Each structure stands twice: as C-alpha cells, then as structure tokens.
Design an enzyme around this catalytic site. Structure first.
Site, PDB file in Angstrom:
ATOM      1  N   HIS A  61      38.039  41.137  38.127  1.00  0.00           N
ATOM      2  CA  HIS A  61      39.009  40.725  39.155  1.00  0.00           C
ATOM      3  C   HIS A  61      40.165  41.716  39.248  1.00  0.00           C
ATOM      4  O   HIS A  61      40.740  41.919  40.317  1.00  0.00           O
ATOM      5  CB  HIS A  61      39.527  39.325  38.866  1.00  0.00           C
ATOM      6  CG  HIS A  61      38.450  38.288  38.871  1.00  0.00           C
ATOM      7  ND1 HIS A  61      37.995  37.676  37.722  1.00  0.00           N
ATOM      8  CD2 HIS A  61      37.749  37.741  39.891  1.00  0.00           C
ATOM      9  CE1 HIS A  61      37.064  36.792  38.038  1.00  0.00           C
ATOM     10  NE2 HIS A  61      36.901  36.809  39.349  1.00  0.00           N
ATOM     11  N   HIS A  91      48.857  43.477  34.732  1.00  0.00           N
ATOM     12  CA  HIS A  91      47.772  43.879  35.609  1.00  0.00           C
ATOM     13  C   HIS A  91      48.338  44.105  36.999  1.00  0.00           C
ATOM     14  O   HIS A  91      49.513  43.830  37.256  1.00  0.00           O
ATOM     15  CB  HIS A  91      46.711  42.778  35.687  1.00  0.00           C
ATOM     16  CG  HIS A  91      47.233  41.486  36.234  1.00  0.00           C
ATOM     17  ND1 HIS A  91      47.850  40.543  35.443  1.00  0.00           N
ATOM     18  CD2 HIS A  91      47.265  40.996  37.495  1.00  0.00           C
ATOM     19  CE1 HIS A  91      48.241  39.529  36.191  1.00  0.00           C
ATOM     20  NE2 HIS A  91      47.898  39.779  37.438  1.00  0.00           N
ATOM     21  N   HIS A  93      47.405  44.146  41.512  1.00  0.00           N
ATOM     22  CA  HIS A  93      46.687  43.675  42.687  1.00  0.00           C
ATOM     23  C   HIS A  93      46.934  44.828  43.657  1.00  0.00           C
ATOM     24  O   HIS A  93      48.053  45.323  43.763  1.00  0.00           O
ATOM     25  CB  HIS A  93      47.296  42.384  43.255  1.00  0.00           C
ATOM     26  CG  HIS A  93      47.280  41.232  42.301  1.00  0.00           C
ATOM     27  ND1 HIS A  93      46.261  40.304  42.265  1.00  0.00           N
ATOM     28  CD2 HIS A  93      48.151  40.875  41.332  1.00  0.00           C
ATOM     29  CE1 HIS A  93      46.509  39.427  41.309  1.00  0.00           C
ATOM     30  NE2 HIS A  93      47.647  39.753  40.728  1.00  0.00           N
ATOM     31  N   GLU A 103      50.839  40.829  46.800  1.00  0.00           N
ATOM     32  CA  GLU A 103      50.619  39.400  46.988  1.00  0.00           C
ATOM     33  C   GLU A 103      51.845  38.812  47.662  1.00  0.00           C
ATOM     34  O   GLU A 103      51.747  38.162  48.700  1.00  0.00           O
ATOM     35  CB  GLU A 103      50.344  38.749  45.639  1.00  0.00           C
ATOM     36  CG  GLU A 103      49.101  39.328  44.993  1.00  0.00           C
ATOM     37  CD  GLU A 103      48.369  38.350  44.123  1.00  0.00           C
ATOM     38  OE1 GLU A 103      48.919  37.934  43.083  1.00  0.00           O
ATOM     39  OE2 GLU A 103      47.226  37.993  44.482  1.00  0.00           O
ATOM     40  N   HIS A 116      52.211  42.794  37.835  1.00  0.00           N
ATOM     41  CA  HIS A 116      52.531  41.499  37.251  1.00  0.00           C
ATOM     42  C   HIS A 116      52.552  41.591  35.741  1.00  0.00           C
ATOM     43  O   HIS A 116      51.521  41.845  35.104  1.00  0.00           O
ATOM     44  CB  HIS A 116      51.490  40.467  37.673  1.00  0.00           C
ATOM     45  CG  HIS A 116      51.612  40.052  39.102  1.00  0.00           C
ATOM     46  ND1 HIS A 116      50.606  39.408  39.787  1.00  0.00           N
ATOM     47  CD2 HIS A 116      52.634  40.190  39.977  1.00  0.00           C
ATOM     48  CE1 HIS A 116      50.997  39.176  41.025  1.00  0.00           C
ATOM     49  NE2 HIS A 116      52.226  39.637  41.164  1.00  0.00           N
ATOM     50  N   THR A 195      48.262  33.178  40.715  1.00  0.00           N
ATOM     51  CA  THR A 195      47.721  33.573  42.019  1.00  0.00           C
ATOM     52  C   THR A 195      46.202  33.689  42.080  1.00  0.00           C
ATOM     53  O   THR A 195      45.651  33.940  43.147  1.00  0.00           O
ATOM     54  CB  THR A 195      48.378  34.845  42.540  1.00  0.00           C
ATOM     55  OG1 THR A 195      47.991  35.959  41.764  1.00  0.00           O
ATOM     56  CG2 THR A 195      49.900  34.785  42.540  1.00  0.00           C
TER      57      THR A 195
HETATM   58  C1  LIG Z   1      45.870  35.414  31.174  1.00  0.00           C
HETATM   59  C2  LIG Z   1      46.687  35.557  32.463  1.00  0.00           C
HETATM   60  O1  LIG Z   1      47.603  36.335  32.576  1.00  0.00           O
HETATM   61  N1  LIG Z   1      46.124  34.894  33.574  1.00  0.00           N
HETATM   62  C3  LIG Z   1      46.677  35.022  34.857  1.00  0.00           C
HETATM   63  S1  LIG Z   1      47.943  35.800  35.251  1.00  0.00           S
HETATM   64  C4  LIG Z   1      47.965  35.503  36.788  1.00  0.00           C
HETATM   65  S2  LIG Z   1      49.065  36.020  38.028  1.00  0.00           S
HETATM   66  N2  LIG Z   1      48.188  36.923  39.073  1.00  0.00           N
HETATM   67  O2  LIG Z   1      50.058  36.846  37.257  1.00  0.00           O
HETATM   68  O3  LIG Z   1      49.624  34.825  38.712  1.00  0.00           O
HETATM   69  N3  LIG Z   1      46.902  34.690  37.206  1.00  0.00           N
HETATM   70  N4  LIG Z   1      46.082  34.357  35.962  1.00  0.00           N
HETATM   71  C5  LIG Z   1      44.881  33.542  35.972  1.00  0.00           C
HETATM   72 ZN   LIG Z   2      48.619  38.849  39.225  1.00  0.00          ZN
END
Ligand SMILES: CC(=O)/N=c1\sc(S(N)(=O)=O)nn1C
Ligand SMILES: [Zn+2]
Length: 257
Positions: A61, A91, A93, A103, A116, A195
């Site tokens: 992802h 990570h 996006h 986002e 993020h 998200t």
């Molecule tokens: C382990 C972890 O960081 N999971 C996450 S972080 C995230 S987010 N994209 O930062 O809202 N969405 N999810 C499922």
């Molecule tokens: Zn994220």
C-alpha cells in the site's frame, strides 16, 4: 481485499469497513478562512535526536520506515496533545502526476505527496491498544511539493530499489527523521482517523503549514514501486491516497494567525 484500484478503491471500503462513513473521517480539506486560530495552542515539541530507525518495508500500500518504540526515544509532545506520543513509523502517499498525491488539501489545492509520521500515546501501553482510543494516535502530516531536492530524503530514495514489491523489506538503520522537517512548525489540527483501513477514529491530526520541497527525480523513484508481489503482473504504486471526506461537526484550529 482493499486497495486503490478501480474495483477495490476508497469508494468500496465502506462495504468491509462501515466506519468509512463515520463522523470523524480523514483526510479533509483545510479551508484556511474557516480555520480557527487558537492562541491556547502550545508549540509542538519534536524530540527525534535519539530516534532509532530499524527497517523499511513495502507493504503493498506504501512503504514504511519503522522505528524502535520500546522506549521514549523519538517523541512528540505539546501542541494540542496531552501526554507523550512515541514515533513508530513514517510513510508517504503520492500520485501519478505532480498535481495530485496528498491526502489533505489546502483550499482545495493538492500537493505532490504527503508525509505521515505516526505516533501513539504511551499511556496505552502498545500501539494495538492505542488505536482503540479517541486520543490514541498523533499523526504529523507534511506536504511535499516538487522543486529543489531534499537531501535528507535521498537515503530513503536510494533504498527503494531493494523493496520494489509487496512484502520486501530491508534493514534501514541510522536514519534521522529530523532531516524531513520544514523550518517552521506552524500547524493546523483537528480530530480524525486513519486514512486507510481499518479507518479507526483514533487520530489527532497535526498538519504543518510549510511544505518541504523535493525534486522531480525523487518523486519519480516513489512511482517505480509496485503494489504487487514479486512474480505477479506489475502494478505501479501510484495514487495511494484517499480523497477528502466531509468535515461534518468538526473545527479545524490553527496555531498561527
Ligand atoms: C501502523 C500504522 O501506522 N497504520 C496506519 S497509519 C495510517 S495514516 N495513513 O497515517 O492515517 N493509516 N494506518 C492503517
Ligand atoms: Zn498515511
């Protein structure tokens, strides 16, 4: 399962994760003229000098850089937060074109990507318990725009070749995340959710106003990753972002005027 394709994208998530239509979903559009300056908002305290990065993983992802969260080594305090939040991973996006990818949006403007930095509230013991609470997580969001190269991001870019496909991981030690922060820590904040599934409403969002600039060459390398596992038909990892959700009964506050 869920993804970002035409048959399993965000518009379908609500079928397996009904909270997708919840009252405090993320991301959202930040309308700068509706945001409420709150002088009661303290400055952010980012303590990343003892951070210990461990690994980098392609999870199908996005790609995550994981940290050691067994102690208070990299923590976030202050701002609209009560307590200490530990950094567990970061990570991004991003999009298929420089005109989309983030986002959150600002007055409807989309950035090339969004970083993020995820933290969890220590009072809950472990991350798994944190996500089940309304003040469980604190995610620091930073916008990326295409321009000059960000030196502190090149080490991540260089290792992407080794985790091209889903499931691949690589040791990733001694990375200092302080190299990814803009000059100013002015921000917007509002209560939200994760998200991507499970879309839990356990997040306090802190979105920095100042974006960081990265080169087109750097974003290009993000777009060479794959959603697919090795040996499977190649599917480029691009546009792994969820569109803005209704603000509903929520107030976005600003730490600056
Ligand atoms: C382990 C972890 O960081 N999971 C996450 S972080 C995230 S987010 N994209 O930062 O809202 N969405 N999810 C499922
Ligand atoms: Zn994220």
């Amino acid at each position: 399962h869920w993804g970002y394709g035409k048959h399993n994208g965000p518009e379908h998530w609500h079928k397996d994760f009904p909270i997708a239509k919840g009252e405090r979903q993320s991301p959202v559009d930040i309308d700068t003229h509706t945001a409420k300056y709150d002088p009661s908002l303290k400055p952010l305290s980012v303590s990343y000098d003892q951070a210990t990065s461990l690994r980098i993983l392609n999870n199908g992802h996005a790609f995550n850089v994981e940290f050691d969260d067994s102690q208070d080594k990299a923590v976030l305090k202050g701002g609209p937060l009560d307590g200490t939040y530990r950094l567990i991973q970061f990570h991004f996006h991003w999009g298929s074109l420089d005109g989309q990818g983030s986002e959150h949006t600002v007055d409807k403007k989309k950035y090339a990507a969004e970083l993020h930095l995820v933290h969890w509230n220590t009072k809950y013991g472990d991350f798994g318990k944190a996500v089940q609470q309304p003040d469980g997580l604190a995610v620091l969001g930073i916008f990326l725009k295409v321009g000059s190269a960000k030196p502190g991001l090149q080490k991540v870019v260089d290792v992407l070749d080794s985790i091209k496909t889903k499931g691949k991981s690589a040791d990733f030690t001694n990375f200092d995340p302080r190299g990814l922060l803009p000059e100013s820590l002015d921000y917007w904040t509002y209560p939200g959710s994760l998200t991507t599934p499970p879309l839990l409403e356990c997040v306090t969002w802190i979105v920095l106003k100042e974006p960081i600039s990265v080169s087109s060459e750097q974003v290009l390398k993000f777009r060479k990753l794959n959603f697919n596992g090795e040996g499977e038909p190649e599917e480029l990892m691009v546009d792994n972002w969820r569109p803005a959700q209704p603000l509903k009964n929520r107030q976005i506050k600003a730490s600056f005027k």
